[PDB]
Symmetry: D2
Subunit: 67 residues, 4 copies
């Protein structure tokens, strides 16, 4: 076809483009849930670390210098 080929393309390019677009919608629903779930663990860690550095006063300042 010369114009059936054309009305075909425009319709597989609108369907292609719509898949990309809203699969883009959920890739960013992914990296948004991802990033702050890390910020959960990074804060659950950063206070598990502090609990250890503070119960580090449970020794002489010589017998535990690390970290």
């Amino acid at each position: 076809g010369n114009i059936q080929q054309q009305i075909q393309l425009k319709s597989e390019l609108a369907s292609a483009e719509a898949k990309m677009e809203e699969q883009k919608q959920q890739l960013e629903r992914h990296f948004e849930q991802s990033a702050n779930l890390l910020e959960n663990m990074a804060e659950d860690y950063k206070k598990l670390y502090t609990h250890f550095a503070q119960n580090s006063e449970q020794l002489l300042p010589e017998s535990n210098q690390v970290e």
Copy 2:
């Protein structure tokens, strides 16, 4: 512009969209595979930090009671 020009371009941006979509597909497959790796890493290091506590609590507090450990 015209009808043969506007055709050979659709032909290019449909191929460029199909190539883009397959690229995007095998770099999701890359992301969830290199994520499943680093996450199990995270788990097997927890199971280090957890059982280093599971024993040092029942081993430095003998008479004392235990919370789940």
Copy 3:
């Protein structure tokens, strides 16, 4: 011989220290637990997320072993 008062007090005292360092080791582990158990629960949250988005965003052909 009556430097026995001193011995019997050094023994009530050093023994008290160990009774208080036993208070602190009970504290340290009981809130090392709930602080640990937090991390644990962030993990299987951040884990299952990468199990849903690993199959709600991806064909059936990448059955990455790690996810159920």
Copy 4:
């Protein structure tokens, strides 16, 4: 008399155990402080794999930089 000898050894027994308890509690910290610096190692990896896979997969993201 002879219990100036039972006490003197009871002290040495308390004093050495108060002591071995201190360097077991010491070894319990050396091994913790290096086991969450394994988990800190893991975290940094997982995060930069999200930064370098949210930037390379999308246009504009929030946390990463």
